[PDB]
């Protein structure tokens, strides 16, 4: 409690040795190494038992250390001359804190992500003499753990050495079961993309070795079961984050063999009754996540062949499945969903209470723990269980714009909904009335809705298309090769003449008297929305003769020479959209207007997008 101000002054002391200006990395060894005395002062203030258990003064400590290593990438490769660089000294010391914090998932994920910053985003500077002096260090310290794991067969091992041997193996395998974004090509066995690495077969070998150890040992310690659940936690984390992770569907897998391995491993884990511990959600999490990846997709047979569940059934007891009430509850839910999707449609009926489909129950109960409702507040379990129960409903499928209107005006589709005029009038009454000045975020959400709703207006006379089956635009979201402005239509309908959403847009955003200060973000949002409108509709005449820049080309003047580069290169993307029309540009006068506009920027920081704006 007294050493929060010490770290709060120490982060300022680290940032004080930045530079004279805002640019500071300093990759080389400067001729001045006093902060290494602070570096030793960081990690030696980390392994302790009294108030290291406080969350904030540990997190600020490791964030201070990552801010030291981020702005000083020379510290890792400073050649602490035993035989190596001191990043090898950093790995095992950093491993000791993580192996002292094995049970708290926050304290090890938050450590390993910044270890990923320290190896990926910092040993890109050095390469060949330094990539192979840490990718071998992991192989040596993992060879050491798998080597010391096998002497527990021959009985001459200890009992506490067994514990931290398994926990250190757990942390080394946990660092590498992340996504590809954490450890990039920094470590040489994680090099290959495409979900298929050198670590995959080595990892499956190590999990088979640790299952062989669990078969070879015989011990009923309670915390041994606690650390024995961590390996199935690790093996379900191994396969759930190699998924492609699409928009809102269940994240599809990349390799069927990894799914087969994880299902076979945790099924062998359950057969030998390993890791039965009271009120522990870990196995239930693994079972529900792996079933959520295999709901009705191409791997469902792969779920039912390699994770059989029908031979633990035991209908005649309130103790329904044998293991533990969380694990038995999750497996009962899985069995309920498999039995539901097995039976025909005429055999199922709707509940009207839990909004789930259900079969003719039993002569017994057998339906309690599946929808009881759910357990102690293990916050992910009940939403997993809701997804497993509610993916069968075959309702209105989730859509991106339907999400962003339900994220914005919640509870909207208790009505007709897919009628297109009522959502326009609801957007109208929200865009005219319900703001005084405060929606500096909600209006940006409104203008991304007004951008995406313009396409859905454009898909009539494109009579069949609908609000639900519009995932993305066919013109503004997907793109093809060649000249990209050939796809937009010269004789598309005019934005002022027919598109009601540009009437809304000019009624609020372009006729407001304070366009010169909304914010940078709302200007970017109005430029994206006006980009989508003028890519689906003809823009109005930029000049009639009475001066009269038409309140949107004025925004192109306001943003094209603006201070930030983002509004500049965003506003340059609609300059070609003014250049394409007919009965406004058939005798090439908007072209001449844009030409004599682009000849009028002798300002240096506009010299970038101008070259884009010409081309």
Partner 1 sequence: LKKNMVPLNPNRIIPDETSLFLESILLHQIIGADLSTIEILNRLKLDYITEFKFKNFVIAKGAPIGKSIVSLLLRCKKTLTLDRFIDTLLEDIAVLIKEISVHPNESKLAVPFLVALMYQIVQFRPSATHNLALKDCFLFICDLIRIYHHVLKVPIHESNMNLHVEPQIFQYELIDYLIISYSFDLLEGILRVLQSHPKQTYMEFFDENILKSFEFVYKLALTISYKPMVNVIFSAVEVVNIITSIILNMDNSSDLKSLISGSWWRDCITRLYALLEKEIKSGDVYNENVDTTTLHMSKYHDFFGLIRNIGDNELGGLISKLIYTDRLQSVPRVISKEDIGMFTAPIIGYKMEKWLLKLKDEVLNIFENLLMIYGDDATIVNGEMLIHSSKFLSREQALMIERYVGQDSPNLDLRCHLIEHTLTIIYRLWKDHFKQLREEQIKQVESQLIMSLWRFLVCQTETVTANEREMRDHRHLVDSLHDLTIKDQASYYEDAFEDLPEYIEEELKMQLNKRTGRIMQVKYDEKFQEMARTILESKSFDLTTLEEADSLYISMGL
What is the footprint of partner 1 within residues 217-256 (CB under 8 A)?
Answer: 217-219, 233, 237, 240-241, 244-248, 251-256
Kindly tell me which of 142 and 501 has the beta carbon lying closer to Zn ion.
501
Give the one entry of partner 1, Zn ion, none that residue 13 binds, where binding means its C-beta sits below a cut-off of 5 to 8 angstroms depending on kind. none
Q: Is 519 in the site for partner 1 (CB under 8 A)?
A: yes
Applying CB under 5 A, the span of 79-87, 470-478, 498-506, 540-548 interacting with Zn ion comes to 470-478
Exposed / middle / buried, residue 260 (Cβ in 10 Å: 0-12, 13-18, 19+):
middle
Q: Is 428 in the site for partner 1 (CB under 8 A)?
A: no
Kindly tell me which of 476 and 526 has the beta carbon lying closer to Zn ion.
476
What is the footprint of partner 1 within residues 569-588 (CB under 8 A)?
Answer: 569-570, 573
Q: Is 107 in the site for Zn ion (CB under 5 A)?
A: no
The DSSP call for residue 250 is -
Kindly tell me which of 13 and 221 has the beta carbon lying closer to partner 1.
221
Give the one entry of partner 1, Zn ion, none that residue 192 binds, where binding means its C-beta sits below a cut-off of 5 to 8 angstroms depending on kind. partner 1
β-sheet bridge partners, residue 349:
358
What is the footprint of partner 1 within residues 318-347 (CB under 8 A)?
Answer: none
Contact status, residue 155 vs residue 83, Cβ threshold 8 Å = no
Angstrom distance (rounded) from CA 76 to CA 19: 20
Applying CB under 5 A, the span of 213-221, 247-255, 473-481, 602-610 interacting with Zn ion comes to 473-481
Cis status, amide bond into 373, omega within 30 of 0: yes
Applying CB under 8 A, the span of 33-41, 84-92, 299-307, 350-358 interacting with partner 1 comes to 299-307
| Binding flags for partner 1, 137-176, as an x/- string (CB under 8 A) | ---------------xx-xxxxx--x--------------
Q: Is 114 in the site for Zn ion (CB under 5 A)?
A: no
Q: Which of 35, 148, 400, 561 binds partner 1 (CB under 8 A)?
A: 400
Minimum distance from residue 304 beta carbon to partner 1 (Å):
9
Applying CB under 8 A, the span of 18-26, 33-41, 318-326, 346-354 interacting with partner 1 comes to 18-26
Contact status, residue 542 vs residue 578, Cβ threshold 8 Å = yes
First to last CA, the chain: 60
β-sheet bridge partners, residue 350:
357
Size of the site for partner 1 (CB under 8 A): 128
Q: Is 295 in the site for partner 1 (CB under 8 A)?
A: no
Kindly tell me which of 541 and 571 has the beta carbon lying closer to partner 1.
571
Angstrom distance (rounded) from CA 234 to CA 542: 61
Minimum distance from residue 488 beta carbon to Zn ion (Å):
10
The first and second tokens of residue 255, run together, are 């390799």
Q: Is 456 in the site for Zn ion (CB under 5 A)?
A: no
Angstrom distance (rounded) from CA 323 to CA 273: 8
Angstrom distance (rounded) from CA 53 to CA 56: 9
- The residues near 250 (Cβ < 8 Å, ≥ 6 apart) are 292, 293, 295, 297, 391
Element (H, E) at 93: helix 87-99
DSSP calls for 326-372: HHHHHHHHHHHHHHHHHS-STT-EE-SSSS-EE----SS---TTTSS
Minimum distance from residue 372 beta carbon to partner 1 (Å):
20
Q: Is 215 in the site for partner 1 (CB under 8 A)?
A: yes
What is the footprint of Zn ion within residues 520-559 (CB under 5 A)?
Answer: 532
Q: Is 473 in the site for Zn ion (CB under 5 A)?
A: yes
Contact status, residue 268 vs residue 418, Cβ threshold 8 Å = no
What is the footprint of partner 1 within residues 483-512 (CB under 8 A)?
Answer: 484
The first and second tokens of residue 31, run together, are 């001729």
3-state SS assignment for residue 115: helix
3-state SS assignment for residue 494: strand
Q: Is 590 in the site for partner 1 (CB under 8 A)?
A: no
Contacts with Zn ion by CB under 5 A lie at 455, 473, 476, 532
């Amino acid at each position: 409690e007294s050493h929060v101000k010490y770290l709060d002054e120490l982060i300022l002391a680290i940032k004080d040795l930045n530079s004279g200006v805002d640019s500071k990395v300093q990759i080389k060894k400067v001729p001045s190494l006093k902060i290494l005395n602070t570096l030793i002062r960081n990690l030696k203030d980390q392994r302790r038992n009294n108030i290291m258990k406080n969350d904030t003064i540990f997190s600020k400590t490791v964030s201070a250390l990552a801010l030291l290593l981020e702005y000083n990438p020379f510290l890792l490769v400073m050649k602490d001359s035993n035989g190596n660089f001191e990043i090898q000294r950093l790995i095992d010391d950093f491993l000791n804190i993580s192996v002292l914090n094995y049970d708290n998932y926050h304290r090890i994920w938050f450590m390993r992500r910044k270890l990923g910053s320290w190896c990926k985003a910092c040993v890109e500077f050095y390469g060949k003499p330094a990539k192979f002096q840490l990718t071998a260090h992991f192989e040596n310290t993992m060879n050491l753990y798998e080597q010391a794991l096998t002497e527990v067969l021959l009985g001459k091992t200890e009992l506490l050495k067994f514990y931290d041997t398994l926990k250190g193996l757990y942390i080394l395998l946990y660092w590498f079961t992340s996504e590809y974004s954490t450890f990039g090509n920094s470590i040489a066995f994680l090099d290959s993309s495409l979900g298929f690495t050198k670590f995959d077969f080595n990892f499956q070998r190590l999990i088979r070795i640790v299952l062989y150890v669990f078969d070879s040992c015989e011990l009923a310690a309670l915390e041994y079961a606690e650390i024995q659940l961590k390996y199935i936690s690790l093996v379900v984390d191994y396969v759930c984050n190699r998924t492609i992770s699409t928009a809102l569907d269940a994240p599809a897998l990349v390799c069927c063999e990894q799914l087969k391995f994880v299902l076979t491993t945790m099924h062998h884990f359950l057969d030998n009754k390993y890791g039965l511990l009271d009120n522990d959600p870990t196995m239930a999490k693994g079972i529900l996540r792996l079933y959520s990846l295999c709901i009705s997709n191409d791997f469902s047979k792969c779920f039912v062949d390699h994770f059989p569940i029908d031979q633990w059934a035991d209908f005649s007891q309130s103790e329904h499945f044998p293991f533990t009430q969380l694990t038995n509850k999750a497996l009962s839910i899985v069995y309920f969903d498999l039995k539901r999707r097995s039976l025909p449609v005429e055999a199922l009926k709707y509940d009207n209470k839990f909004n789930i489909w259900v079969y003719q129950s039993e002569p017994d109960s057998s339906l309690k723990n599946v929808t009881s409702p759910f357990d102690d507040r293990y916050k992910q379990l009940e939403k997993l269980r809701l997804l497993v129960l509610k993916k069968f409903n075959k309702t209105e499928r989730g859509t991106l714009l339907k999400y962003r209107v339900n994220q914005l005006s919640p509870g909207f589709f208790q009505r007709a909904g897919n009628d297109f005029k009522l959502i326009l009038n609801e957007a109208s009454v929200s865009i005219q009335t319900c703001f005084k000045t405060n929606n500096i975020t909600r209006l940006t959400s409104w203008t991304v809705i007004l951008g995406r709703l313009a396409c859905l207006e454009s898909e009539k006379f494109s009579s069949t298309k609908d609000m639900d089956n519009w995932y993305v635009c066919h013109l503004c979201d997907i793109e093809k090769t060649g000249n990209p402005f050939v796809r937009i239509n010269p004789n598309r309908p005019e934005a002022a003449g027919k598109s009601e959403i540009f009437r809304i847009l000019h009624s609020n955003f372009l006729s407001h008297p304070n366009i010169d200060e909304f914010s940078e973000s709302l200007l970017s949002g109005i430029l994206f929305s006006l980009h989508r409108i003028f890519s689906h509709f003809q823009p109005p005449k930029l000049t009639d003769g009475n001066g009269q820049i038409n309140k949107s080309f004025k925004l192109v003047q306001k943003c094209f020479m603006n201070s930030n580069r983002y509004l500049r290169l965003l506003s340059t993307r609609i300059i070609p959209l003014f250049n394409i029309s007919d009965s406004h540009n058939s005798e090439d006068e908007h072209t001449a207007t844009l030409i004599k506009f682009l000849q009028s920027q002798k300002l240096p920081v506009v010299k970038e997008n101008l070259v884009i704006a010409w081309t």
